[PDB]
Every structure is written in C-alpha cells, then in structure tokens.
Design a protein around this ligand. Sequence first.
Ligand SMILES: NC(=O)c1ccc[n+]([C@@H]2O[C@H](COP(=O)([O-])OP(=O)(O)OC[C@H]3O[C@@H](n4cnc5c(N)ncnc54)[C@H](O)[C@@H]3O)[C@@H](O)[C@H]2O)c1
Ligand SMILES: NC(=O)c1ccc[n+]([C@@H]2O[C@H](COP(=O)([O-])OP(=O)(O)OC[C@H]3O[C@@H](n4cnc5c(N)ncnc54)[C@H](O)[C@@H]3O)[C@@H](O)[C@H]2O)c1
Ligand SMILES: [Zn+2]
Ligand SMILES: [Zn+2]
Ligand SMILES: [Zn+2]
Ligand SMILES: [Zn+2]
Lengths: 379, 379
Amino acid sequence: SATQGQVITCKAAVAWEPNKPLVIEDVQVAPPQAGEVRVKVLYTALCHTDAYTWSGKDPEGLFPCVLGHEAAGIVESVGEGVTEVQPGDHVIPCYQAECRECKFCKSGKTNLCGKVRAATGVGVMMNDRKSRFSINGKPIYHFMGTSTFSQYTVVHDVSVAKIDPVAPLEKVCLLGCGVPTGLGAVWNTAKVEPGSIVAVFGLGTVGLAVAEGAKAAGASRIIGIDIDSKKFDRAKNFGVTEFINPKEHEQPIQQVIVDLTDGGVDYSFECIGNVSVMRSALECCHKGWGTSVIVGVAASGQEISTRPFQLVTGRVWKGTAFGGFKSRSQVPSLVDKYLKKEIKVDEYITHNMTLADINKAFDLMHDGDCLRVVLDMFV
Amino acid sequence: SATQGQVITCKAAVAWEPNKPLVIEDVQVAPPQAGEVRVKVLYTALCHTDAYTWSGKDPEGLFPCVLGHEAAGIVESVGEGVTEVQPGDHVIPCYQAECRECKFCKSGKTNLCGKVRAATGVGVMMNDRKSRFSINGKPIYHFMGTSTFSQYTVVHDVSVAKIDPVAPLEKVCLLGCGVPTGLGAVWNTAKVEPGSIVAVFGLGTVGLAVAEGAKAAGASRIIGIDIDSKKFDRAKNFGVTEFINPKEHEQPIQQVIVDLTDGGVDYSFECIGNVSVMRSALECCHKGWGTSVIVGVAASGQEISTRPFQLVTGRVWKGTAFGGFKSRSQVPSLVDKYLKKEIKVDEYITHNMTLADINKAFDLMHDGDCLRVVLDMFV
Ligand SMILES: NC(=O)c1ccc[n+]([C@@H]2O[C@H](COP(=O)([O-])OP(=O)(O)OC[C@H]3O[C@@H](n4cnc5c(N)ncnc54)[C@H](O)[C@@H]3O)[C@@H](O)[C@H]2O)c1
Ligand SMILES: NC(=O)c1ccc[n+]([C@@H]2O[C@H](COP(=O)([O-])OP(=O)(O)OC[C@H]3O[C@@H](n4cnc5c(N)ncnc54)[C@H](O)[C@@H]3O)[C@@H](O)[C@H]2O)c1
Ligand SMILES: [Zn+2]
Ligand SMILES: [Zn+2]
Ligand SMILES: [Zn+2]
Ligand SMILES: [Zn+2]
C-alpha cells in the first residue's frame, strides 16, 4: 500500500450532533496501531441502529462521530502483531468481536466476546484509548468499533472477518448485521424444529431474515405481523405464509394470534424494538413450551413487562445479539453459503446509492419504503 | 368400604372469607361420580399457596372453600370407569393433573395437562360441574382439584398418584407440592449442569428443595438469599454453601451477587413470589448464558419487568409449575427415591399438629418460625 504507515485523508459522513444531517467531511485516518486493521470501506449499508444513535435515543452515543456498522471492503494495512489478515484481503468488519480465547469465546453457549468492549463502547481504540479519526486535530469518535461511513476505518483485529475474495462486496456488506441476526435468531437462539409454528413481528430486513431462517428450519406456518399492509406482498418470497395487521383488530395482537394457532405459536420473534410488542410476542406463545426471542433493539429506559404466570405456565423469554453467530469464525461461512446459493442476500437490497446520497438514504429509511440501502463509498 | 355409594359427614377446615380464620365444620362429602376418586386424607401439610389464596391475593380464589393441596391418604371409593386406583390404595392427590392423552401430556415438552382445568379452576368436578362438598345443602368449593383440609375429599382420577403402600403418609404428603417443585425446578426446568453457580432467592421449603436439587446436580456454589438470617443456619444441611441477606446491603441484591460471581450466576431460582425479587434474580444471572427460573407464585395484578437488553445479551427468563413433573407418572418414582434415601423429605417437616390446630399452624407459618407443618387429620 502507498499509504502504509501514513495518516490517510479521505471522505467520511460525520454525525456532528444528534438529529443533524450527516456532513461529508475530509477526515484524517491515522495508521493502525498494535492489533488493529485499517480498512478501505468499498460499500456500506444503512441500518436502524445507525439512525437510533443519530436520533439521540442512545445512552452510549458520542458526538461528533462516524457512524455505520454494516460494510465490506479490503485491508489497506495492518498494525503490529496482526497476522490473521494482510493488505489486500477482503473483509467484513463486525460490531461483535471474537477474540477466540476468553470464557465467552471458548464456551459454545454465546457469541458475546467482551475483549474490546471497554474501548469500542466509548468510541476509541484499545491500544491507546484514542480515536483514529480527526478533523483539524480534533477527534471524531468511532461507532460500534466499525465507523463504516468513512472511506477508511480502523478496527480491532478481533472484529475483522476474512472472507472469500470472489464475494461481491456490494452484497456481503449485509452479512455484518441484519441478515445473520434474523437467520441466527432462528437457528442458534431459538433452534426452531421442523413443523414449528412461528410468528414474526415486523417485516423489515430482520423480520424477513427470521422468515427465511424459519423456512430453512422447516416451520409449517410463518405468521407475519406488520402495521404496514404494503410489506405483506414482498414477505411471501421470504417464507411468510400468513399476515396480520394489528391496526385491523380491536383485540390485542396476542389474542388474534392465539385465536389462529389453537393456543399460541411455538416461536415468536420481535424484530421492531418496541417493548409493548415484545410483551405481545411473549403472550402470543403457546402454554407449556412457547419461546419468544427479542431481536429488536429498544430505546434506553424502555422496560419489558408481563405477568410472571406466563413464565410459570411454560413460556420462555429470551433474546439474540447478531443471531448468536461468532463473527470471525462464522461470517466467512455465511459468505460461502451465500456464494453457494444456500442463503439469500441480494433480495434484502432495494437501493444502491453513493456516499454523497447518505442523507437521502436515511430519509428512505425513515419513510419505511425500502429494505437495505447500499452505499458505494468510492464513486 | 362401609361408606361406599353414600354421602360422608366429616370434619373440614373451611375458609368462608378471605383473611378470616379457618373454621372446622361438619361437611357432607358426596360419593364420587364417573372418573372420580374419594380419598381418606390421613395427613395434609400447609403450603404458602394455601395462605396465598386465603389472603385474597389469588386471581382464581373462590369462597367459601376447602383449601389444602399437599396430602397423602387412602382411596375410600372410586366412581364408574375408574381402574387405576381401587379402595385401600395409598395415594397422593395432585393439583397438576395428568390425563396421559392430551396435546400437553403427549408433547413431551411440558407437564401442564389442561384436561380438568375448566372444573378445578372454578372449584367444581368435571362430571356434573358441581362441588362434592356442602354445609346445610349449600356448596363449598374445591381448591386446586384437591381440597385436602377435609378428612374426605373427592378428586378426578387423572389427579391421583398411586404410591408404594409402605411409604409413611405423614412424610410423603410433601411430595404433592413443595419438594418436587424445588427439585424439579433444577432437574427438569433449568437442567443445571455439574459445576454450575446457583443463586436461590428465599430459603423456605421450596428454596431449600432447590438447594438439594442443585446439590444433587453437582453445582459448585449455591448462594442462599433471604431477608431472615435465621433461615441460613438450617440451609447448610440442604446444600446452601454461601449466604446473603439483602437488608445488610445498600446496593441492589443483583449487584451484590454479580460482584461475588465474576459477572453473575449460571442459574437463579426465585422461591418467594415477589416481582421485584424476580427482576433481581434475572439481573444477577451471567451475561450470555445465565438462566432465571421463577418458582414463586405472585399476587394478582403484579407484573415482572426488566430492560430487554438483559435478554438480548443472553439471559433466559423461564418458570416452573410443579418442577415440570408429570404427576401420576413421576410422583410414585419420587416416593421410591425417598424410600431409597436418594431424596430428603423428613428434613422439611418442622411441626406435626392436628386438624383442630390449623389456625395455630398458619400463624406459626406467618411468623416464619417453621418449614412444613403436617396435620394429622384423624387424631
Ligand atoms: N439484536 C441484534 O443483534 C440486532 C441486529 C440488527 C438489527 N436489530 C434491530 O432490529 C429491528 C428491525 O430492523 P430492520 O432493519 O428490519 O428495521 P425496519 O424498520 O425495516 O423494520 C421494522 C418493521 O416493524 C414494523 N413495525 C413497526 N411498529 C410495529 C408494530 N407495533 N407492530 C408491528 N410491526 C411494526 C415496521 O412497519 C417495519 O416493517 C431494529 O430495532 C434494529 O435495531 C437488532
Ligand atoms: N411454581 C410452583 O409450582 C409452586 C409450587 C409450590 C410452591 N410455590 C411457591 O413457592 C413460594 C415459596 O414457597 P415456600 O413454602 O418455600 O415459602 P416460605 O414462606 O416458606 O419461604 C419464603 C422465603 O422467602 C423469604 N423472603 C421473603 N421476601 C424476601 C426477599 N425480598 N428477599 C429474599 N428472601 C425473601 C422469606 O424469609 C422466606 O424464608 C411461594 O410463592 C409458593 O406459592 C410454587
Ligand atoms: Zn445493522
Ligand atoms: Zn472473546
Ligand atoms: Zn393431559
Ligand atoms: Zn404447595
């Protein structure tokens, strides 16, 4: 690399303050330190998690920052002691790290490695507890250990998945968040059996991946719930067999579902981040065995509630983070499955735009009429 | 049987109103109809659930009623179609029925048979939708399908566990509720693995059985939490290895437990019925895999709450009903384990009294100066 050891000056979409449109700035991206990787971000996708922090409803939120966490690109350079990746490798930076050596990593019970959490949680790098981004010497915080809204980003080596170089980067950028979250919520978290009756609450990218996961798992019925009836038609291609719009019914949604399933569903998945809907997803589950998985991310201060008899009578309340997938170990497999036509990726993308269109893309995101928007960072 | 086909006049502890002392009355106990069994209740133990309903805090509480659900006795007579039990058999009447043929019984995922619930949940028998108890021609409702505070009671055949006739009825009456509840909360519900770190909230009979269950499960640490330090001393014999009294700490109890366990326990059991303590028990679980089992029965209208983040970060919220044990199929096996000294039963009994002392026995329970109190019905 022509830039090895040097401070890079590139374009980045900077979130200067909450609710303010992103400003495309020239930022300085410092070289990778010990155990870090500088990535050329070719393509990034937009997620509701980016907008959630941008909105100001996030307690972890630090301003000014470079948002974005769903991307794919190429290793520009590596810091001291980095050997798992090298300049030129095709990678997916992940918000979920995998150090492969801690209690969380070694016990096949969870994917939640906490090695770099103290650093990533505060918009900084572990090696020096500083950000690698600056404008006129002043720091711009990192976001979710990824900051993929920058042409160049610096991430911890433990968060870098090395992928198949033939994979189309404008597609595989979705394998860093939404699609594995939905798929894994079914396969890893719930472990849905064939014949199961599944309810999916919210038919956005995540809800659709849950439907594809449940179809792959051999569910007999996939009930799609969304307040927007226009989202029902596209859902059928993702495996959804039945539809309910809660606004079309005076009785609580949980009652409507119990009334169609002879007692309730085997599995429910809340793919919105709405606490009232989380309670409904639990209560629509069948007595004795019904399991509800929260996939959606609620705003800070919101609490879930139910009457404890729902649990005493056999319902199970749980949740998922990145579908329970181990980033460095499993994202490369999801890419291989995608390349081998075992899983859908392309179908979740409704728009391709450029970095300059970032605000226009967040406007599409607010309106609800899109699935994933992919940004070409270098055009 | 001298009383076959006939109405029995016997003594019963009747609860006329919530919160008023139990009155010993002469009651008429009609003969069993199709599918029913009339039992001579030799011994009955008092449970917190009996006091829970008497205190007016049960959503299903009906008055006047004959309370009691932990008993052991002898089959006096059987109704038409009854073949599994016959006069003279030693039995344990169970509040959790097992028809062996329904959706729940055949599922293999639960013990929550709902065959006779339309009747027991409303203080009546299924055959004629009427009670078998009356005073001056006026009905006295059944309670939990058992009504063991009566010398003679009529139960559904699907709620009768036939047991080894050598088993002492003054001990095995406990195998109808509290002891299998705690043991099973561990073995069936949580499925605690060897080396697990366990937190038991409330060190009453149920909490102590959870400690015995966890000890048999090969747990490395059993943390006993109780607001009464007096309950700690006897708890050591049941497997409790460490003690915490929440009143001795300014920080919330979950924080105290997390501090002592390097992030939280593997399994927590709430054995009280207090919704704030239920939230604490969930929050004291280790991120990624920690599981909380609600065992305690909460008051009407009380709700459990937490931040959805607790579940998204891997904690599992579940509950148990009769420790997940199949009544007719498994209660005889537990009586066999007890006689083999594989399980403790005797150790949970602190007092033996007579039916006439029922009110004295509940006052003793209110003061927290006992575990199980066994009433001799016929002396
Ligand atoms: N846990 C994880 O690791 C993780 C990962 C990725 C995304 N997420 C979360 O998943 C959620 C969904 O992501 P997405 O990209 O699919 O978003 P989205 O906006 O495209 O989808 C949300 C859907 O829910 C619908 N909806 C809104 N309110 C509803 C209600 N009351 N009842 C029914 N439907 C309702 C909307 O119409 C929309 O179709 C977000 O909260 C996101 O933060 C979590
Ligand atoms: N789920 C089931 O199938 C089932 C079956 C049997 C019993 N139960 C329930 O189990 C519960 C306990 O039964 P038991 O007979 O062991 O009761 P118990 O009264 O003997 O014991 C309760 C204990 O909780 C302690 N306690 C109270 N508040 C506390 C707090 N804030 N923090 C810590 N400790 C606290 C008390 O000091 C007491 O020792 C009851 O709610 C009963 O209904 C449930
Ligand atoms: Zn995302
Ligand atoms: Zn790790
Ligand atoms: Zn049944
Ligand atoms: Zn009981």
